[PDB]
């Protein structure tokens with residue numbers, strides 16, 4: 001990367017906001033997954049959207065790849081600089097704007113995390129529900145199409161992103177639903193907002209997101225429920241969903257995950273396949289939801305609910321940290337994760353089969369999942385130096401992905417494709433799907449410089 005080019009970057013954002021130092025590049029060459037660190041040639045911190053546009057135009061016209069970087073909590077290698085280039089760390093733009101409490105909407109810049117937003121919203125009666133376990137950039141969550149424990153009731157990022165501000169690869173500024181616009185529904189033109197949600201930085205740089213806010217629940221109750229078997233826990237889940245109980249959160253942990261979370265968070269739950277549950281409503285609605293849900297879990301052998309502000313907070317913090325709880329089972333390990341999502345009636349077969357396949361292998365695996373969406377993760381720890389053990393892990397991961405595709409499902413419910421699931425995506429949508437996605441990539445990024453090597 002030439003010295004004239006670095007000086008051009010410094011001319012846009014300022015000398016302190018450009019770095020070519022090896023350590024700084026290495027910190028921006030990986031995310032939270034096992035994908036090997038591939039450091040960008042430089043890291044740049046633009047201070048406003050005009051600077052994002054000018055950095056993008058400089059890179060694009062000089063044939064230099066661009067890698068958008070949020071909080072680096074992704075798990076599919078989205079930020080790995082597989083072709084080098086310039087990593088654009090967006091987190092110094094961290095302002096919340098256009099809070100419209102009467103319209104239940106807000107605009108956030110990439111440095112805003114869900115915890116910052118919900119702190120800002122305290123005493124408003126509103127909250128933002130989409131809750132990945134990591135305190136991630138909200139614009140990064142828009143870019144990956146994230147979901148969370150609350151999505152079963154309150155929707156994913158796709159459901160709660162109203163508008164996006166995007167710097168296209170050549171620097172043009174696009175407001176996907178129109179500048180400043182926010183509304184509940186529209187048929188105006190093609191829906192550009194949904195194209196950029198889940199685009200993982202391959203179609204442009206999200207520089208603000210307009211988010212749907214939700215009313216805080218009148219009352220909340222959380223509980224855990226222990227089951228004699230995975231089959232029993234997942235049958236309960238399916239039957240709760242088919243009974244249309246509007247549960248706010250329904251999270252599955254197998255016994256391995258439960259034990260790991262106990263050891264990592266000082267929970268003391270019985271070591272068993274377990275549901276973490278939460279219910280929202282008034283006192284009447286809560287009592288109704290509870291006995292309909294307790295009736296179903298009892299039929300499948302569930303324990304009486306172990307009830308849990310401080311105690312629910314610890315419960316859900318433990319769940320949100322399950323990734324790190326799994327990693328702490330084998331210190332020094334990194335992890336790959338599966339993320340399949342299947343039609344809910346097929347969830348019992350595939351979870352039980354996955355548990356059986358983990359047992360029949362030499363592999364350490366913890367299962368945790370947004371099973372209310374028919375989604376779950378198998379977190380697979382790896383010795384970073386054990387090459388034979390890594391080939392067994394992606395081999396297991398590909399096979400699980402192909403089993404989900406065989407059931408009519410998808411290889412990723414929320415984490416995305418990045419580097420790891422590109423072959424599965426080709427199988428999932430077929431040749432016409434792949435070519436159509438590639439034609440969209442090509443019109444927005446003709447030179448192929450927008451986070452190359454990812455998704456397609």
Ligand SMILES: Cc1cc2nc3c(=O)[nH]c(=O)nc-3n(C[C@H](O)[C@H](O)[C@H](O)COP(=O)(O)OP(=O)(O)OC[C@H]3O[C@@H](n4cnc5c(N)ncnc54)[C@H](O)[C@@H]3O)c2cc1C
Pocket residue numbers: 031032067068069070071072073074075077078079090110131132133134136137139140141142143144145146147148149200201202204205206207320321322323324414415451454
């Ligand atoms: C402990 C833990 C728990 C998690 N739980 C969940 C969960 O429940 N659900 C879930 O969906 N994910 C979960 N994740 C994954 C991760 O937090 C999400 O994918 C999150 O959306 C990543 O945001 P980020 O800014 O950290 O991404 P990064 O790693 O910085 O980037 C992710 C991808 O998006 C691109 N990108 C980032 N910001 C932008 C931007 N502004 N514009 C364009 N492209 C951009 C990057 O180029 C990359 O390809 C979890 C991760 C951890 C470590």
